[PDB]
Amino acid sequence: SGVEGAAFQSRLPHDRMTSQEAACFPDIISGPQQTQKVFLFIRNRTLQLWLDNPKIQLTFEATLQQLEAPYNSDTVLVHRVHSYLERHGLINFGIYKRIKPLPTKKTGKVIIIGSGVSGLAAARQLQSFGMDVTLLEARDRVGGRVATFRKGNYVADLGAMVVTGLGGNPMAVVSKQVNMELAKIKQKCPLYEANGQAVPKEKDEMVEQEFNRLLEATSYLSHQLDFNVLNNKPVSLGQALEVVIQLQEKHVKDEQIEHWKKIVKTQEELKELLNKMVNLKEKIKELHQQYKEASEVKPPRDITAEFLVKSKHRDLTALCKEYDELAETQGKLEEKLQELEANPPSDVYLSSRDRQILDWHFANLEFANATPLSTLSLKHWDQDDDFEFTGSHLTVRNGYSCVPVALAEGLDIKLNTAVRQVRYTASGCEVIAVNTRSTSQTFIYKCDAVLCTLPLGVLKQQPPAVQFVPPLPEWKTSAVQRMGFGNLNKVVLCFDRVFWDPSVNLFGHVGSTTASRGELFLFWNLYKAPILLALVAGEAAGIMENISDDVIVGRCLAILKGIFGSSAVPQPKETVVSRWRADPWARGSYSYVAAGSSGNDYDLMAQPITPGPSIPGAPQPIPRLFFAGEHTIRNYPATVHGALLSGLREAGRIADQFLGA
Amino acid sequence: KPPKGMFLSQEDVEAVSANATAATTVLRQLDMELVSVKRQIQNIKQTNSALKEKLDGGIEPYRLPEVIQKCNARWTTEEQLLAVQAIRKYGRDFQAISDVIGNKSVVQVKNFFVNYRRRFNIDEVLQEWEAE
Ligand SMILES: Cc1cc2nc3c(=O)[nH]c(=O)nc-3n(C[C@H](O)[C@H](O)[C@H](O)COP(=O)(O)OP(=O)(O)OC[C@H]3O[C@@H](n4cnc5c(N)ncnc54)[C@H](O)[C@@H]3O)c2cc1C
Ligand SMILES: O=CCCc1cc(F)cc(F)c1OCc1ccccc1
């Protein structure tokens, strides 16, 4: 439906109020069901009007004229709902033509560290709300980990490049606001073993299915056997997969032993039967000789001599009957023994070729999580799964940077300004920064509030890139330690001609060892100009950063030559190699749910910091230091949409604090 | 509740995780276990192959022809004397006694046991059979 789709598209249950709405409308959620339904319709309809045209501001006055009775009768209720949606960034976010131009009286001063998407989205919001906003960006560009290479006609993304399903995705609204050339990613992905030969269709499917079953198995291992701690440490997805694979190899040997034991039991039953026959044959042989001697006593004979012939005769036919039955049983056993000898269970759980293709599927997962599987929390690594959007995944053909560049229009952004120190007190904040081009030029920024959107990698640095004065409390630094910050890298290869399959967006290279499974394992055909992207995932990400570009590009061309032929692959005209772990403004690619961590640490990351009183005995200070970024949003971590959402969240939180709700 | 064709007992899980090298040890002992079962199959195949080679010839040089005799009702003296000896040797095995005489049904043998019980000391004869 329509108003129902608006709720779904806003990640909202259409027939129930959320925890957030309860907080802002406690009178309604604690009241009768009828008013809650009226509220829910007002909310869903206002969402719909905004979604049905997100290029212009949906004002309260506009909203009311479009509501019909009975819902437009409590105008206070409608105004309250509208303002709630506006403040929390569910309507009038992103890039929209403003009806009422921005009032000149600005209230409050906020410094935003970082002008990636999270920082940019917050800033746009905070400006919309009337605050004075300045962003401090270390790099010479906006976007952070949205980073588009551009040279000539070549356009290729070194960071984020995939928009997940548009259903429920706030990037859908953004894509109607910015010219993004979104294109579906066809998921078909042929694999080529290390020798360049394609993986036969039978094997690609047998192993993908086994890969999926191995994942299920770890989840069974996690939930049903409570196998979540081993040797006093948290179990990882990697360990669990090892244990599952070991047990499948064990079951194969158990099945082999059971099989040959049925053969031994049957051979031995046959041995016993043959011994019974050679003895019976000898007994028959000797008895026949007796019958022969007795029957050669020529008649006329007395009746004992006759009895001897006739009873040896009878005794002999009985033993022959006994022997004939034992030979019928010998055929029944040689049957079992030949059927068994022909029904041998599987020789191996996975062949070496199998295991290598399996490792490609593990590398593909190491890619999706930007970390080796031995670091992923077994209990929690797929906790954001029940929030996946609906629809096909897409790429951005004109380069994802079009989004942050667009969000930056109109904002006060100081590029080449590396924050070194964040000072926050009961009376306000000071951010000390330097010019990255000459670190001696020092800058002091005073403000009412600091929104920190530094990447989790930067927060993790020891010794620190950014000092907090006073230091961050233990509950926040402990979260920063526990949370995973992973790594993932790309090689952009720009050719003058297309030698790959044009109707194929993905293809895989199957590395020959487990260790190297992440090394150039996947290639992307996503763009208009002939460009392939190659991924370096898992353990390979960090190791390939200490290898020169020429060698990395060399390994690529070697792989592609093996798949497409040596004559088909020219030298690239342009090449780029990301090194995200070494990027001091990133120190990795995105967060992952590490063993020993959990979804609650993402909540801890988002909690703002409140300084203590300047004067002792003075009233409780307001919060001064806020946090956004992909590491701060429990349900959508490690994405662009998650970062965008986190900025919208904090802008509502800051505006509630400094403008009042 | 594990996936079909996955095998994951609590028992086996602990056995493969209780130690740093528990897994490879477990699988090594199953490798040697399978080796010694295959070794044992080889010895029996060869033992049984030697036994089969002794049964070369079946029992065919030793099977008599199967004669049928019209089951007659009259007891010749010679047939009565065969029965008494068959009682002495086979006891109450009425079938074997019939097979020895040739032309006497199992029942006719049974009837013989009573009608000539007195005159042939059949009781003494059965007692005589039970000694050896
Ligand atoms: C290789 C790669 C592939 C990815 N794939 C996808 C994908 O396809 N789709 C998707 O949705 N997500 C993907 N992601 C994740 C996504 O890119 C990020 O989650 C998101 O873009 C980060 O947003 P953010 O605003 O939290 O952080 P950032 O964009 O990192 O913003 C932080 C900003 O702070 C700046 N900064 C750092 N230190 C300082 C300092 N001392 N002073 C001042 N400024 C500083 C940084 O330079 C940066 O501009 C990928 C990421 C990478 C790196
Ligand atoms: O290049 C960037 C990919 C990084 C990424 C990290 C996430 F946490 C969630 C994502 F959606 C995602 O991007 C698309 C993707 C989806 C599934 C599997 C792999 C990638």
Side-chain angles (χ1 to χ4, degrees):
Chain A
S1 157
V3 288
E4 308 175 358
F8 173 82
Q9 181 55 34
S10 303
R11 307 155 298 283
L12 286 175
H14 69 104
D15 51 9
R16 174 172 48 90
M17 298 177 52
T18 67
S19 191
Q20 217 155 97
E21 290 166 332
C24 296
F25 303 89
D27 54 315
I28 290 180
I29 193 187
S30 62
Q33 282 294 314
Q34 166 59 5
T35 76
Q36 309 184 28
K37 200 205 185 305
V38 179
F39 168 88
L40 288 164
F41 178 91
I42 292 173
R43 171 248 263 162
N44 291 344
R45 184 74 170 115
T46 302
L47 291 174
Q48 178 179 41
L49 293 157
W50 159 247
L51 292 167
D52 283 2
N53 187 7
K55 269 181 160 149
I56 71 190
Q57 184 199 342
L58 180 63
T59 70
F60 160 65
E61 299 78 8
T63 296
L64 196 54
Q65 286 144 1
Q66 295 238 55
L67 285 174
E68 292 305 310
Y71 301 106
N72 65 3
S73 78
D74 191 351
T75 73
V76 187
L77 183 51
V78 176
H79 192 113
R80 280 172 76 201
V81 170
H82 178 281
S83 303
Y84 166 83
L85 298 175
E86 189 162 57
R87 184 50 69 80
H88 295 241
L90 284 159
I91 63 180
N92 304 317
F93 68 91
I95 308 166
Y96 43 103
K97 178 174 185 284
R98 197 174 176 87
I99 294 189
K100 34 183 78 171
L102 286 162
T104 178
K105 193 199 78 174
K106 292 181 179 187
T107 294
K109 171 55 170 194
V110 184
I111 284 294
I112 303 189
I113 303 170
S115 59
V117 168
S118 63
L120 286 161
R124 274 218 149 234
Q125 290 299 87
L126 285 175
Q127 203 177 61
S128 285
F129 299 168
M131 307 197 76
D132 188 336
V133 186
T134 289
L135 300 95
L136 304 178
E137 175 53 46
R139 305 171 191 274
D140 51 2
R141 64 168 171 92
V142 301
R145 292 170 272 176
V146 178
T148 301
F149 166 72
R150 296 171 189 277
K151 197 159 182 184
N153 278 325
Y154 296 134
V155 168
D157 264 304
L158 298 168
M161 60 180 176
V162 175
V163 178
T164 56
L166 293 187
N169 182 337
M171 298 319 290
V173 172
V174 175
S175 74
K176 292 179 206 114
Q177 292 177 340
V178 184
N179 183 34
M180 304 170 74
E181 302 185 353
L182 295 180
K184 281 192 170 176
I185 295 175
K186 306 202 208 77
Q187 293 297 331
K188 175 114 181 187
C189 177
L191 311 177
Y192 306 86
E193 303 177 75
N195 68 341
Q197 297 295 60
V199 170
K201 175 170 189 279
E202 160 171 5
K203 214 158 206 50
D204 201 4
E205 298 183 338
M206 184 274 288
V207 177
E208 185 163 357
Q209 185 206 108
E210 196 64 21
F211 162 70
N212 292 326
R213 297 148 55 77
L214 287 167
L215 275 191
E216 279 176 72
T218 62
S219 179
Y220 176 82
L221 194 50
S222 175
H223 289 84
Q224 306 298 302
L225 305 186
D226 207 332
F227 179 75
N228 297 306
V229 162
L230 178 51
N231 281 29
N232 223 36
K233 298 165 289 178
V235 169
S236 63
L237 183 52
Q239 300 179 45
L241 291 158
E242 269 162 36
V243 159
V244 172
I245 294 189
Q246 282 153 359
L247 293 179
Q248 300 328 285
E249 285 170 11
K250 163 168 180 319
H251 174 265
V252 156
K253 298 180 197 285
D254 284 337
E255 206 68 17
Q256 269 162 16
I257 291 173
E258 185 184 64
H259 177 258
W260 302 101
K261 279 198 172 156
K262 267 158 216 165
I263 296 185
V264 162
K265 178 161 171 185
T266 283
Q267 292 279 18
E268 265 176 29
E269 197 180 333
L270 179 72
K271 179 187 185 176
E272 173 162 321
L273 190 84
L274 297 180
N275 276 319
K276 199 163 178 182
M277 285 173 69
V278 300
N279 292 334
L280 188 50
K281 179 183 163 192
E282 293 311 310
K283 186 165 175 181
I284 281 171
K285 174 179 172 183
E286 158 184 357
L287 188 43
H288 176 88
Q289 187 50 230
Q290 289 169 17
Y291 169 84
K292 212 181 167 285
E293 287 164 6
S295 67
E296 275 155 20
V297 180
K298 284 184 167 175
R301 18 201 204 215
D302 72 25
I303 199 56
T304 60
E306 198 76 45
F307 175 77
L308 184 58
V309 171
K310 283 188 203 317
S311 63
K312 291 293 162 192
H313 190 292
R314 176 270 155 195
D315 290 356
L316 186 63
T317 74
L319 285 197
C320 289
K321 186 182 177 168
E322 179 183 359
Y323 180 99
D324 283 340
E325 299 170 2
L326 268 55
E328 280 270 17
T329 292
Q330 181 198 348
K332 288 180 48 183
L333 287 191
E334 284 172 315
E335 278 193 32
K336 291 183 51 187
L337 198 65
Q338 203 168 33
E339 169 170 15
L340 280 171
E341 187 72 27
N343 285 328
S346 281
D347 197 324
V348 63
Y349 172 56
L350 295 175
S351 64
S352 297
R353 266 180 71 196
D354 291 329
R355 180 67 170 92
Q356 285 158 331
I357 311 185
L358 185 56
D359 272 330
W360 184 97
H361 292 289
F362 292 143
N364 193 37
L365 193 61
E366 278 168 342
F367 149 50
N369 293 271
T371 188
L373 306 183
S374 50
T375 67
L376 274 182
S377 169
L378 167 71
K379 201 163 191 157
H380 305 302
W381 71 275
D382 58 337
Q383 51 104 36
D384 66 327
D385 194 68
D386 293 345
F387 299 90
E388 290 262 338
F389 301 138
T390 67
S392 307
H393 292 177
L394 315 165
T395 59
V396 192
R397 277 199 133 202
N398 49 332
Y400 214 156
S401 79
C402 65
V403 160
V405 168
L407 294 177
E409 185 208 26
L411 296 192
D412 183 32
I413 300 162
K414 314 308 197 188
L415 300 166
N416 296 318
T417 310
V419 168
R420 301 258 193 96
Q421 186 177 113
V422 175
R423 289 209 157 232
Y424 57 97
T425 64
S427 14
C429 310
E430 274 181 309
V431 187
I432 295 95
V434 302
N435 188 9
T436 56
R437 304 160 285 188
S438 70
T439 54
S440 35
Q441 279 175 26
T442 307
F443 300 92
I444 313 282
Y445 297 97
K446 293 174 210 266
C447 50
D448 301 294
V450 174
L451 176 54
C452 174
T453 88
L454 293 163
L456 175 69
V458 165
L459 293 175
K460 266 178 181 292
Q461 250 185 271
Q462 294 301 324
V466 174
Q467 183 193 357
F468 287 92
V469 185
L472 296 189
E474 178 274 347
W475 61 261
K476 164 91 50 168
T477 63
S478 289
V480 164
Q481 280 162 47
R482 288 189 301 265
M483 295 206 26
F485 201 61
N487 191 11
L488 173 68
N489 278 305
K490 314 188 170 183
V491 182
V492 182
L493 300 166
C494 304
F495 309 88
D496 60 324
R497 61 177 68 122
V498 173
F499 60 88
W500 52 90
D501 196 325
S503 65
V504 168
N505 301 137
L506 312 156
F507 56 96
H509 154 71
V510 180
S512 45
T513 52
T514 294
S516 62
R517 76 199 181 182
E519 168 162 324
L520 305 172
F521 81 104
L522 184 55
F523 290 77
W524 302 66
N525 166 25
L526 306 174
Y527 302 109
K528 194 169 175 46
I531 293 162
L532 290 181
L533 269 64
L535 294 191
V536 187
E539 300 289 27
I543 296 180
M544 296 284 286
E545 280 193 20
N546 307 325
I547 292 154
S548 61
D549 289 358
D550 284 8
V551 171
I552 304 175
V553 174
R555 295 186 183 176
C556 281
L557 302 178
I559 292 172
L560 298 170
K561 282 180 197 300
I563 300 176
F564 298 111
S566 196
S567 52
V569 184
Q571 296 302 314
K573 300 304 184 177
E574 297 291 340
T575 60
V576 184
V577 180
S578 80
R579 313 189 38 257
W580 284 102
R581 195 61 98 191
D583 184 341
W585 317 125
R587 290 245 186 275
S589 58
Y590 42 92
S591 59
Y592 68 83
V593 184
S597 181
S598 82
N600 169 72
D601 285 345
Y602 292 79
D603 286 341
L604 294 183
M605 285 313 296
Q607 216 183 293
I609 307 284
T610 288
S614 290
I615 307 102
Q620 173 73 33
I622 68 185
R624 292 283 185 192
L625 182 53
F626 303 77
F627 296 87
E630 62 88 8
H631 58 297
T632 68
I633 184 155
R634 178 165 189 156
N635 295 348
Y636 310 88
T639 65
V640 168
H641 57 261
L644 178 89
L645 290 165
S646 78
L648 301 187
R649 178 195 74 211
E650 291 311 304
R653 192 211 298 275
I654 288 161
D656 279 352
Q657 186 69 230
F658 290 91
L659 310 173
Chain B
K1 208 210 165 293
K4 291 191 174 193
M6 293 284 149
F7 296 81
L8 307 165
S9 48
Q10 182 74 247
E11 188 189 25
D12 290 332
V13 164
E14 309 181 336
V16 185
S17 61
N19 178 32
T21 56
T24 65
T25 293
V26 156
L27 309 173
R28 189 184 295 116
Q29 313 304 330
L30 296 190
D31 277 351
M32 298 166 181
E33 181 64 35
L34 179 79
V35 157
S36 79
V37 179
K38 279 184 191 165
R39 199 184 315 265
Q40 180 60 4
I41 294 190
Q42 271 317 303
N43 276 276
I44 306 195
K45 263 183 190 182
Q46 273 181 247
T47 278
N48 283 358
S49 180
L51 293 192
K52 268 161 70 188
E53 194 165 357
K54 279 179 174 167
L55 305 183
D56 178 83
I59 50 169
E60 311 309 311
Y62 312 111
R63 193 180 276 97
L64 304 163
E66 175 183 340
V67 190
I68 185 56
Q69 194 163 8
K70 41 194 77 175
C71 209
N72 201 259
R74 197 174 300 255
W75 287 86
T76 74
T77 301
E78 265 85 5
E79 285 157 16
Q80 300 172 352
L81 289 161
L82 292 173
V84 160
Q85 291 170 92
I87 289 168
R88 177 59 179 84
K89 170 159 191 173
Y90 298 93
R92 295 168 189 86
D93 192 350
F94 305 119
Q95 175 60 233
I97 290 187
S98 161
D99 300 330
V100 164
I101 308 180
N103 58 86
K104 289 293 179 296
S105 88
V106 185
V107 177
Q108 295 176 347
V109 172
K110 264 185 62 181
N111 297 328
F112 181 89
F113 261 82
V114 161
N115 300 127
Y116 291 90
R117 184 149 151 281
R118 35 153 168 270
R119 299 177 273 182
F120 284 159
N121 297 266
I122 295 191
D123 291 358
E124 269 182 19
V125 176
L126 295 150
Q127 292 171 345
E128 205 77 20
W129 168 74
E130 302 175 3
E132 46 190 41

